[PDB]
Design a protein around this ligand. Sequence first.
Ligand SMILES: Nc1ncnc2c1ncn2[C@@H]1O[C@H](COP(=O)(O)OP(=O)(O)NP(=O)(O)O)[C@@H](O)[C@H]1O
Ligand SMILES: Nc1ncnc2c1ncn2[C@@H]1O[C@H](COP(=O)(O)OP(=O)(O)NP(=O)(O)O)[C@@H](O)[C@H]1O
Ligand SMILES: [Mg+2]
Ligand SMILES: [Mg+2]
Lengths: 352, 358
Amino acid sequence: TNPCEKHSCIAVIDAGSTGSRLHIYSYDTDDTNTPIHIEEIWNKKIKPGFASIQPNSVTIDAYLTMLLADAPIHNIPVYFYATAGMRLLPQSQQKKYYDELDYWFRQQSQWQLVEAKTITGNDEALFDWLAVNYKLDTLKSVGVMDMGGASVQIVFPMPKNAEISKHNQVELNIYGQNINLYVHSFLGLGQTEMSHQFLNSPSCFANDYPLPDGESGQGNAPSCKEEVTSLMNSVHKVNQQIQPLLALNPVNEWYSIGGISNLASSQLFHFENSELTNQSLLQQGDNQICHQQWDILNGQYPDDEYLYQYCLLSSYYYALMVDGYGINPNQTIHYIPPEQNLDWTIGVVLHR
Amino acid sequence: TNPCEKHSCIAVIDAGSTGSRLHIYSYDTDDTNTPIHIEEIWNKKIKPGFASIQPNSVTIDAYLTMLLADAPIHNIPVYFYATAGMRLLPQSQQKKYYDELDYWFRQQSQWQLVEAKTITGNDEALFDWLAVNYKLDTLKSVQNKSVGVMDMGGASVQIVFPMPKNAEISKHNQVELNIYGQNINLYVHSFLGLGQTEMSHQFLNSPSCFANDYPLPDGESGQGNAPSCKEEVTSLMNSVHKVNQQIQPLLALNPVNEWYSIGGISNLASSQLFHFENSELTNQSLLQQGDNQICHQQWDILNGQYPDDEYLYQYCLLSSYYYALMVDGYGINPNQTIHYIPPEQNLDWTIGVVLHRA
Ligand SMILES: Nc1ncnc2c1ncn2[C@@H]1O[C@H](COP(=O)(O)OP(=O)(O)NP(=O)(O)O)[C@@H](O)[C@H]1O
Ligand SMILES: Nc1ncnc2c1ncn2[C@@H]1O[C@H](COP(=O)(O)OP(=O)(O)NP(=O)(O)O)[C@@H](O)[C@H]1O
Ligand SMILES: [Mg+2]
Ligand SMILES: [Mg+2]
């Protein structure tokens, strides 16, 4: 039975840097017409990222058709929201994608496209916080981090302030509560973009890993983390931007979504209760990957295509959270299990 | 009538991060079977980069078909050499591309594929140096001058210059060539991630790096100022990559008399926004012109003037970045002439591959 016959349904597409995810949600609304009882009734992922394909009609039509063809239900509103992958492209180039995508939607009737656009990382951060808090049942101090492929977001409660950019603040009324959040997104600090600066760094790879430029890995996670910290703080000034704010607005519980949940759940790392600490993350990466002999390690774990980057990723998450955001290395960080497929798209259901 | 009916020909494909370029060269050989009288007889360039497409047989087949199909001649050795766009990928993901590429060529009636592989940046640098010094005719005789070459690519940058063998420098960063009866020792270095595309992804929300009121992706407005943009880019060059500490001491010990640059810098310098004489720039002049003509302009006004240039929005950032890399990184004097090659000449490192007998 189609839930959309009897309940509001929308489709939200998270067009992320590494792939697009369609979610169809059914929901009801309460007496202020705010969604409740939100349920995902369909999901479909496809790779690669929308911003990575050629922006011509044949390629874009094929991608959208592949994304939507097996949806059991249709004739519902669609929000197509691209994130940091598309943010990396100039307007002129993004325009080619949206002109072809708009045309494809206009030329068909199975989906009612509401909006297709690149959202800002600040909007993305708001959606991240709403989606995680919706799932946690908190909406009736929680910080959220989304560790993406091309950007990362951080978002936490902070009273409305005149000294910070209006761009970095959002005020929300949800289930009759007033909420003010600081939002920030760091474009270029997502895992794929960041990693392109460190691929010839021997400290960031297992011993004897073959670096692209012919040297050998000689892994050491505290050294690799220091290198990544220079990108975080000397280049993007993460610490200068975030730490004074977290100082004055401490966060009681941290939740993370994005690639860190895949790292933490992989067979190389050992965490309980879907949570980690930065100290443990760094140590595990240092001892289980950085200090291992690559050939031997690669032979032991042949079915993890991310294995080669784990010394770097563990060092990078520590640099970002501890040296960037100022989070205590012993503070618990909850991550949402990957099986949940949780991205920010719930936040779009809610806001609107 | 091909010149290939009367002269040896080779195809060399530069599979770069931003696109692929097929060159076919005719040449003769001298008394050692070394190529001489090298001439480009065909060139075709396509976009996007090889490494940016999905590695299934359909896409690879369309791509290669579009690159190779209308070439005047097939029964010639081919060298397919990918550079920094493929280096960004782990060996396992690259293996997929080469598997299908190898398959595809084997279905071709004539093309004799000699090698298809990803080259290191150090090899790319050796080819960069050979290609430019071949065009300058400086390879047949010992020079009274040191010629330095830079290749300003989209995903890596190379720098290469003469340097006597140094047992204190990694063997990886040194190359001894023998060509045309001549012994040449070079320092080579490639900086992966400092190519213009990869670097730019770190600075897209930097208001100093874009024209006034340019719509930055996270919703703030451009407010360009090239020296400030330049100082930001310098943090990536030096605080992250330590370019100044790696390169400047070496150039102090091994001074270069003439600098040549190839790569996308020629496209920037050749823009109608810039004024340069004799296909040469200086970093001071590039930074000043970017500052005046882009950083300090009103984006809506400037875009309305050049609705059809897809690169213009980045010219404040690129002017600043080239200065950061060449001056604050490599220590090149900002008033020193940097020779660039007109884009129409299609000079990339692929001539170096013709001379690989070096
Ligand atoms: N098993 C894994 N271990 C470590 N990282 C992983 C793993 N699987 C996927 N990733 C990466 O996790 C990162 C975050 O993935 P994801 O959150 O899907 O990014 P995205 O939404 O596509 N990017 P963005 O547009 O910036 O939000 C990406 O860099 C993936 O490449
Ligand atoms: N018509 C043009 N006008 C201005 N800039 C251009 C033009 N065409 C190309 N470019 C710039 O040049 C960059 C590509 O330089 P190029 O040296 O071709 O890199 P590549 O060989 O593809 N990358 P790599 O693998 O690292 O060597 C492009 O990203 C553009 O920024
Ligand atoms: Mg994402
Ligand atoms: Mg190149």
